[PDB]
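Subject: Interface between my chains keeps coming out wrong

I've been trying for a while to get a sensible model of this assembly. When I model each chain on its own everything looks fine, but I need the whole thing in one frame so I can look at the contacts. Pasting all components below, labels as-is. Any help appreciated, I'm running out of ideas.
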Amino acid sequence: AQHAVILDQEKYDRILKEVPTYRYVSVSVLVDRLKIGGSLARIALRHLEKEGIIKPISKHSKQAIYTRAT
Amino acid sequence: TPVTLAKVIKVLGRTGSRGGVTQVRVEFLEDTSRTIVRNVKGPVRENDILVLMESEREARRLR
Amino acid sequence: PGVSVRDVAAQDFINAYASFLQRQGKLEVPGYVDIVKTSSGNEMPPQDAEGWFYKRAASVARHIYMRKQVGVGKLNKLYGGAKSRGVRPYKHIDASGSINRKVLQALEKIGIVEISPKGGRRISENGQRDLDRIAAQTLEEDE
Amino acid sequence: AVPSVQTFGKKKSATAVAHVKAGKGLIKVNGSPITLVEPEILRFKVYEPLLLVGLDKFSNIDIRVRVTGGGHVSQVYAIRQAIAKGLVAYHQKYVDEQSKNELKKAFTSYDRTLLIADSRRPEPKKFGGKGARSRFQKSYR
Amino acid sequence: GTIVLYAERVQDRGLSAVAQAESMKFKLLNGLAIRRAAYGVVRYVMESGAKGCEVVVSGKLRAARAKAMKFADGFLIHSG
Amino acid sequence: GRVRTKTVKRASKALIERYYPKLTLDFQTNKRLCDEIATIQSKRLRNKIAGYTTHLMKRIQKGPVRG
Amino acid sequence: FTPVVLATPIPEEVQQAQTEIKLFNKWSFEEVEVKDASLVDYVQVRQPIFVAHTAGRYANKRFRKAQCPIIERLTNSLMMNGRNNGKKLKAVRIIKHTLDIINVLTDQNPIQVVVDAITNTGPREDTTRVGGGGAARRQAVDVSPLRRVNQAIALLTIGAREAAFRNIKTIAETLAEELINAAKGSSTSYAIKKKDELERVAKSNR
Amino acid sequence: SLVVQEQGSFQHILRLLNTNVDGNIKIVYALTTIKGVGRRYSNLVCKKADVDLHKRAGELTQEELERIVQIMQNPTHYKIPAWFLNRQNDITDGKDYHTLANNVESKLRDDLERLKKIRAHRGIRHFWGLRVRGQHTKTTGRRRA
Amino acid sequence: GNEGAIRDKTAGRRNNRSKDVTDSATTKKSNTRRATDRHSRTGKTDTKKKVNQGW
Amino acid sequence: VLKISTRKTPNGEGSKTWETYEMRIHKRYIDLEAPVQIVKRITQITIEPGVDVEVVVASN
RNA sequence: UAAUUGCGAUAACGAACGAGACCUUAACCUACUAAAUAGUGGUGCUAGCAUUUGCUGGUUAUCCACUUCUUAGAGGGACUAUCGGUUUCAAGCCGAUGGAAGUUUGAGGCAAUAACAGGUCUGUGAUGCCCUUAGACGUUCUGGGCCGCACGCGCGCUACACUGACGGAGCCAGCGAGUCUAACCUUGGCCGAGAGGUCUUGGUAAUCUUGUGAAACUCCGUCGUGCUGGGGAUAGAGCAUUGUAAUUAUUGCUCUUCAACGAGGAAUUCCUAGUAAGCGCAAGUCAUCAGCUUGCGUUGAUUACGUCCCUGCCCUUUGUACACACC
Ligand SMILES: [Mg+2]
Ligand SMILES: [Mg+2]
Ligand SMILES: [Mg+2]
Ligand SMILES: [Mg+2]
Ligand SMILES: [Mg+2]
Ligand SMILES: [Mg+2]
Ligand SMILES: [Mg+2]
Ligand SMILES: [Mg+2]
Ligand SMILES: [Mg+2]
Ligand SMILES: [Mg+2]
Ligand SMILES: [Mg+2]
Ligand SMILES: [Mg+2]
Ligand SMILES: [Mg+2]
Ligand SMILES: [Mg+2]
Ligand SMILES: [Mg+2]
Ligand SMILES: [Mg+2]
Ligand SMILES: [Mg+2]
Ligand SMILES: [Mg+2]
Ligand SMILES: [Mg+2]
Ligand SMILES: [Mg+2]
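Reply #2:
Try treating it as a single job with all components included. I did that and got this:
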């Protein structure tokens, strides 16, 4: 109810331009960037991995971890 | 800030009515040849190193 | 080389065989599936909704492949976890016999299992067959 | 028959039996590769003797292990035990004393009780509490 | 016929707790002074060559308030 | 605490008194002696004893022991 | 490193990093040194390990608690507050994650960062309640190296725990967070604050 | 699963079965703010109305929403069993209902009344504001009323 | 009967709830006599003859 | 081992002490291939107060 | 020293009960005697995958051999051993090494003399005395009651979530117990969403239930901090099981209803290693009912290894007009 829950176009764009300079990226990180609830944050993770920016260094459920691509 | 390292050279025993406190005679490493008796808070044996936050002041008993 | 299913990790295998039974179409799913719960020790239905009956079939197969014979009673016990009795302490509780007896019946029609003497269900010869083949498939996905 | 020794390992009430015969270097537990063996976060506990004493060494032998009893951690500490004991048993009867004794030196100098079973065992509970030492709560009034 | 009874004297009743308790019973019930009763039991047990023996009498004798006594002699052990 | 009862300490005395030739700085053989030369009802009590008749012997070799 | 293959096969990265160096989940024990004299002795590091599990008999004797590999002491301490007693597998994993996380941030042996935050958060001197007649003041004391490590482990893991409570950051991040900030005390860490305050009050009564 | 987009299609908060429903909540659980629909009931109803459970409540085509109700208020025609239902065997027409929204209130009312009206101990017990499933009333339940 | 029971006002929770509670509800053990355990009440007494005659 | 675990007390007062009795049952079996005569000879004798002897025949 | 356990001092010397010893259980035996009611390897008969011999299984006897794992008889083993530090170089304590094991090896059983107006006449066909004894305080039958609810107090269970809940998947114990003149422990097959029902079946048991595939736990997902999908009180409606009987709802299932509870004031309990804590199981009770207990194993820490501050006790000294002994 305090907003983070859908996709408001500007949002998607924010997610593509802002995730560089993220040495650490995970569910808790994506939430903390004043946006995305844990759900669509988790969907974002899979989809920012579709290509680039984030590198899968950690495995699993409960904990993701990613790094800027190089 | 100065640090001041002193190596425990002897264990004297327990004080503090509770008995958690341990008297000990230490020896500095940075310039030895001088010894002081301190009161420790944790468990202690011979040859351990206390970081005396200040260097010249010893205690005795504890109530 | 040459292969077994024991040569393959449980989740890799079972999720592989699951997709298979799915990707296939030959099955016999009860039809009460989607409205049913799998154990009274549970709270919600499966979240896989469409499917999950494949997950248990694939699981049930693999379990029977790994041993002599097993009945519904054993699988009801295998599959059932702790039930919250609300404010009263947890008790283990058996799972649903319908799900399993129909999983066993379906797998047999598809000829992956057979009504072993002594009792229960033994892996079928044609089960040994196909299971070892998809196990072989999944190791190959990591060639 | 070929050269073959059988050994065991225990931790709590787990008991892991090994059969180390002469072969082409397999390492299987119950009936699966030693590379599976999940609880997973512990997998390197059972790889451990292999890497401790050089991943070769096993080329002349076959190893099978069957654990019953204990639980999902007990059984790991037991199976790694019987594995390393089985390696030192085999050299003991077949290879040579130096080779064997080198092998004990490696294990012990590292060791998580690889050759030597942990005597720790559950203490009996006694009436007046839910545990062995723990006591029921009292009040005075 | 499928059950059969045989009597048997006992090798010296003097080393038999049960025999000697029953003796006290019959001693007291027959009117003997408590101490006389217990000593005679003790001294006859000893005389049967026991290592030691002990007699307790507890309860009420003639006075309202209940009492107890120990009549022992020789050697006993008490634990393990 | 591992303080030996008198039964043990007394029996060692008695043994070291009258079998000092035989008996040795070695428990293992002191053990065996105690079987042939004394009657003891439990292995544990004999071990206990022989371990201490050993101790007393070991320090006799380095000056007397009162008793 | 010379690869060797037998019947049932061992994975390259497993064959690799293992037989060579005896390093962590996959982290270097070499280097990794204790920047504060003392603490060396009461911070382990070498002999090196694969994971922080161990059937360790560290209890039955007064000081041998110290011989335990410090990382595994750190994890051991994660598994508490009733609901989580036991549950080392739970814990061990958290550490594995934590160390990964830490490494992402500012490079460094993550295991070294752990070392640093320990060394950095143990009260050099402290205080104890001395009788002195009802109204009991606070006699200052210097504190043991052991108590310095212990306290630091506990301080770290507690702050992480409470920071972890009731919020979206996972327990492994808060732990990593605490450690990172504590590696060179940035006063924004629960542990340092307390360390600093504990020495503030000890000093204030001498 | 996917990164989506959507225009201004979905509306936050939507009203159905005489009550209000938050839009930015998964539609299964969003439905539960309606009385007489618990997690199970909602779950099955959505499955039957051929809706994507993965969806939020806000998305949902008005046709979907129309379906979701239709089934809710006639669960027997759309092959939901009956053991699934909170009022099998009425006690008057003896039919099988699933009472929903503002209506569960009146039926609780009705039932409580039928007991009292017939003077059955349970009913008396209700009228007194006591516990009625026979629990011990010495120690427990003392704030209340 | 049951008809009376529901009709009876002065009944059910509401009416109790609105009554103060007796203080006996919060009393004590009450004890009464215990430090007189050894001082026999019987007024009687054995006598040294009767005890000697018995023991 | 047959356990029986009872309170020591006939009544209820006191710290609640518990006390388990046990009875140990030892069972054994020896297989013999023999003629009729020895069987009876060897079962009438070798009797003992406190030892329960049972002799079953047959392969089934 | 855990110990009137010992050393030592010594008008005492040398002993006995209690402590210790002893006994039971848990630990160690590739040494002993064996085992189709335990199990291994080989061999046949045989399935699958590979095929280059291989890998993974089926087969209460198709044969042969073995006893490492299991079982339980007889032994063996440890004595704080070796070394060292400390000490009246005494009893001992401390560290290092070795060791299955070195905290009384760990945990129990047993346990002297003496005290209490401790509890129990509601365990007893143990019992004195008193009471009662046919309109009974005997007994039995029907029904109600011990559960009654403004509220005070104690043991508990479940929780306040994200080290989590939920959903799929992995999937591992130990202590136990079971039916004769009876209906106990129940595998397997069908039916049923479930609870359960039905047809058969093995077991008087290391033989069958049962590898009691237990739960925490592990993995992959959904949810995403919102009294939320944490929490599950209260209540409605329905289905079944035990029983002659279930209303004041025995218990079980299903849908629905979804309370307090956001870590708890003064206070207070328990605990030192396979212990605390978490987690379930069997047994007792039991027709049916465990939120209780007695045990059991599973996962497995932090912190002491000290003291006399609090509290409790014990010992000396000392006072006494107490000895029915400060009630
Ligand atoms: Mg299970
Ligand atoms: Mg499950
Ligand atoms: Mg004695
Ligand atoms: Mg004793
Ligand atoms: Mg819980
Ligand atoms: Mg609702
Ligand atoms: Mg109640
Ligand atoms: Mg053997
Ligand atoms: Mg050692
Ligand atoms: Mg009295
Ligand atoms: Mg009585
Ligand atoms: Mg009552
Ligand atoms: Mg109590
Ligand atoms: Mg789960
Ligand atoms: Mg039906
Ligand atoms: Mg029969
Ligand atoms: Mg809610
Ligand atoms: Mg819930
Ligand atoms: Mg029961
Ligand atoms: Mg009871």
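Reply #3:
Confirming on my end. The beta strands of chain D are 4-11, 14-22, 27-29, 32-33, 61-68.
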